[PDB]
Nucleic acid binder design. Structure first.
Ligand SMILES: [Cl-]
Ligand SMILES: [Cl-]
Ligand SMILES: [Cl-]
Ligand SMILES: [Cl-]
Ligand SMILES: [Cl-]
Ligand SMILES: [Cl-]
Ligand SMILES: [Mg+2]
Ligand SMILES: [Mg+2]
Ligand SMILES: [Mg+2]
Ligand SMILES: [Mg+2]
Ligand SMILES: [Mg+2]
Ligand SMILES: [Mg+2]
Ligand SMILES: [Mg+2]
Ligand code: NA
Ligand code: NA
Ligand code: NA
Ligand code: NA
Ligand code: NA
Ligand code: NA
Ligand code: NA
Ligand SMILES: [Sr+2]
Ligand SMILES: [Sr+2]
Ligand SMILES: [Sr+2]
Ligand SMILES: [Sr+2]
Ligand SMILES: [Sr+2]
Ligand SMILES: [Sr+2]
Ligand SMILES: [Sr+2]
Ligand SMILES: [Sr+2]
Ligand SMILES: [Sr+2]
Ligand SMILES: [Sr+2]
Ligand SMILES: [Sr+2]
Lengths: 115, 150, 142
RNA sequence: UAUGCCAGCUGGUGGAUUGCUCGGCUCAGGCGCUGAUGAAGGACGUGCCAAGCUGCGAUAAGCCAUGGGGAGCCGCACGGA
RNA sequence: GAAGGGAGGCGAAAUAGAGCAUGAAAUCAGUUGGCGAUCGAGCGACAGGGCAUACAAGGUCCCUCGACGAAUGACCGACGCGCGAGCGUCCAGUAAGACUCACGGGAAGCCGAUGUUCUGUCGUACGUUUUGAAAAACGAGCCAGGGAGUGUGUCUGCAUG
RNA sequence: GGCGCCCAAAAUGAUCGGGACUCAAAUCCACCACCGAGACCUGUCCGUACCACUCAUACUGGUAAUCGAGUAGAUUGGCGCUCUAAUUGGAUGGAAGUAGGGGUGAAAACUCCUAUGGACCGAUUAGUGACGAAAAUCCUGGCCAUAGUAGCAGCGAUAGU
């Protein structure tokens, strides 16, 4: 039983999208976010660096942390970013919230789920 | 104590009541039962007859061990409660008195309602063998009487 | 010279053919008394239901004659559950403002019992004007 | 219909319940030694009438001084004088 | 009779009159309803009758006929089999068929409900011990009130932040 | 070969459950028709699981021949009690409590009416717990049957009228 109202709306949004638009990643991300917090992702830059490719939004069904180096110009969408992750990322790419990703890409196309 | 458990029209009725009398409650219950309906005058003649040993009081409820009495009608067990009887005569003496002071014909009035109520026991203690002491109490009885014009 | 109950005492709710069907069913079927086992054998044991827990309990083991045991199977129909026997949905009411939003066509009002004569008078008249029946109406001699 | 069974009514018995709190329980802050100049404790006295409590000590519910206080008072304790 | 009782007086109230706010149960007296001196015992549950019922907080219920009509499902008649009891084919998946509704008529102790009692079906408490409890195994006379997973520290999960 | 008969004695009153039964109401061989569960079939509803829609575990629609018993135990939603806070209500035109009665809920329980009472009482949400009893030869208090019963006689002191 999530207690955070925001995480709760974000989930309702992801669903509305996956159902209305051609989403599936969004419904897949909502699925995981509905599971308990220990299962949510905690990803450091190093991993996003190792598997991300330009022109393919990285979607982390959790929170992005700041260990390691990110040089690729990638747009990372996540539930949250640590103050440092958002900073290190903005230097080479763009950090956006899933609320925005669903906004520009309700069809959830050209995306890479990273955990 | 008790309060009259039955309504009584003042213009055609006279009341009386006994309070905390230490006497057999079981006897009271029996005497009441018996005189109910009788005339105050008749009830008094009856109670004097019991006291005298000429009229037995039917013991229908608390009759354990009591021996049969021929003069008892439609029942077998009976006795002659002289103490409780003298107490009802007192009650009746009060009732008829009040009745008269009001201008009624006391004796001629019908015992509309009469009932006894055990108000409590007076604590007593009797020493027994083996170092113990058991209860030895006296029942305390209230009794209500209502005289009604015929 | 005679007593008359204030308000729309005779008003009836308008139910779909189906709600009426189920309402009539609830009323036809009814249900067991569902009192506690053996409550009638010991004064110190009250009627309130307690699941029979004894390992040998006749009722617990379902012996015919020992009384039915509480199961979801006995639940009344959803479409009617909780309706007054008249078919109205009841709405507890504490004051005049509580009458606002109430649909007198399918809902009836029951003024809390704590409410006093002064405030009932206001509530009762205002409810009639809104076409709302009061389940516990004040009777006056008119 | 007796004796009687089950439920209710009226009245008892009983004192649960609800409401009330002069007492507790706990925490916190402050303060902190008394006694041969005979303490603490106890006994016995002490009131118009006085048994208990409280106070007091043959000056005995009190005596004196300074300040406060104030039209009333004679303790708990609503009596009589 | 400084008792108690009756009458009276005060007060909103004495059913506030002295362990004197409220006044439950066990239980007692009187009394009402039902049963009752030819009849049988876990005291009831479910269904159906009798009798009983001021109002309020429930308002339904009965009878004709008609509509709908699941599973199931005929009599009669006709024909054809069987030693016989009886069966087959057609009539016919028709008439009938629980519930529900409509028309017309009716009930106001009348329908529900509550009390009690009668009838039918089932039924030797409850909790515990035990492979096995109605148990000739253990516990309680009855009622009210009281009556059993709590704290600190440490460890290990888990949900949420 | 079939049925039977002898063999064949037990302690309160004989027995196939009983009555009782003889071309049977017995036994055996065939057959005919029926009665009889909660099983199976059928209507409606409930719960649960899964599906579709959905923010929803709220509605609504759909699927279950392949869902529906349960001790110990695991898991989950809910009822009720105290006091705190926030939001918001009721009460002398009568609160709480109690008694009797009506309505709802599978149920824990919620609610209304009448009487009594005569001053306090809730709801929602988040908390807080000395939070729920039929049981422990459980505790304390009160009360009934026992029962108008036993004792009020017995002793080397029979004591009175
Ligand atoms: Cl990582
Ligand atoms: Cl007695
Ligand atoms: Cl449910
Ligand atoms: Cl139907
Ligand atoms: Cl526990
Ligand atoms: Cl529930
Ligand atoms: Mg004798
Ligand atoms: Mg001794
Ligand atoms: Mg009981
Ligand atoms: Mg009192
Ligand atoms: Mg609120
Ligand atoms: Mg308790
Ligand atoms: Mg005896
Ligand atoms: Na005789
Ligand atoms: Na005789
Ligand atoms: Na000090
Ligand atoms: Na045991
Ligand atoms: Na047992
Ligand atoms: Na045995
Ligand atoms: Na005893
Ligand atoms: Sr007797
Ligand atoms: Sr009220
Ligand atoms: Sr008087
Ligand atoms: Sr048909
Ligand atoms: Sr089940
Ligand atoms: Sr089950
Ligand atoms: Sr199962
Ligand atoms: Sr407790
Ligand atoms: Sr006794
Ligand atoms: Sr003698
Ligand atoms: Sr002797």
């Amino acid at each position: 039983s999530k207690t955070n109202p925001r995480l709760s709306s974000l989930i309702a949004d992801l669903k509305s999208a996956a159902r209305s638009s051609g989403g599936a990643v969004w419904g897949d991300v909502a699925e995981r976010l509905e599971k308990p917090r220990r299962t949510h992702a905690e990803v450091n830059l190093g991993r996003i660096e190792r598997y991300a490719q330009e022109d393919e939004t990285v979607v982390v069904p959790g929170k992005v942390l700041g260990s390691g180096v990110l040089q690729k110009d990638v747009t990372v969408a996540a539930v949250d970013f640590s103050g440092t992750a958002e900073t290190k990322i903005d230097q080479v790419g763009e950090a956006v919230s899933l609320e925005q990703a669903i906004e520009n890409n309700p069809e959830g196309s050209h995306v890479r789920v990273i955990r | 104590g008790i309060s009259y458990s039955v309504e009584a029209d003042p213009d055609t009725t006279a009341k009386a009541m006994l309070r905390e009398r230490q006497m057999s409650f079981k006897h009271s219950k029996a005497i009441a039962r018996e005189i109910k309906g009788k005339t105050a005058g008749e009830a008094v003649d009856y109670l004097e007859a019991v006291i005298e040993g000429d009229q037995p009081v039917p013991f229908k409820q608390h009759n354990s061990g009591v021996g049969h009495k021929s003069k008892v009608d439609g029942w077998d067990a009976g006795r002659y409660p002289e103490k409780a009887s003298k107490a009802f005569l007192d009650l009746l003496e009060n009732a008829v008195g009040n009745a008269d002071h009001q201008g009624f014909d006391g004796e001629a009035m019908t015992i509309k309602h009469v009932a006894a109520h055990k108000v409590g026991e007076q604590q007593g203690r009797k020493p027994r063998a083996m170092g113990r002491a058991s209860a030895w109490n006296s029942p305390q009885v209230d009794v209500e009487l209502i005289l009604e014009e015929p | 010279t005679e007593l008359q109950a204030r308000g729309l005492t005779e008003k009836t709710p308008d139910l779909s053919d189906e709600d009426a069907r189920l309402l009539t069913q609830r009323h036809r079927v009814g249900k067991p008394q569902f009192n506690r086992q053996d409550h009638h054998k010991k004064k110190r044991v009250s009627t309130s239901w307690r699941k029979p827990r004894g390992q040998l309990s006749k009722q617990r083991r379902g012996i015919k004659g020992k009384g039915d045991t509480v199961e979801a199977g006995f639940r009344s129909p959803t479409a009617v559950r909780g309706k007054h026997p008249s078919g109205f949905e009841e709405v507890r009411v504490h004051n005049v403002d509580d009458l606002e939003g109430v649909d007198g066509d399918t809902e009836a009002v029951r003024i809390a019992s704590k409410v006093g004569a002064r405030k009932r008078e206001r509530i009762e008249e205002e409810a009639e004007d809104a076409g709302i029946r009061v389940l516990n109406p004040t009777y006056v001699e008119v």
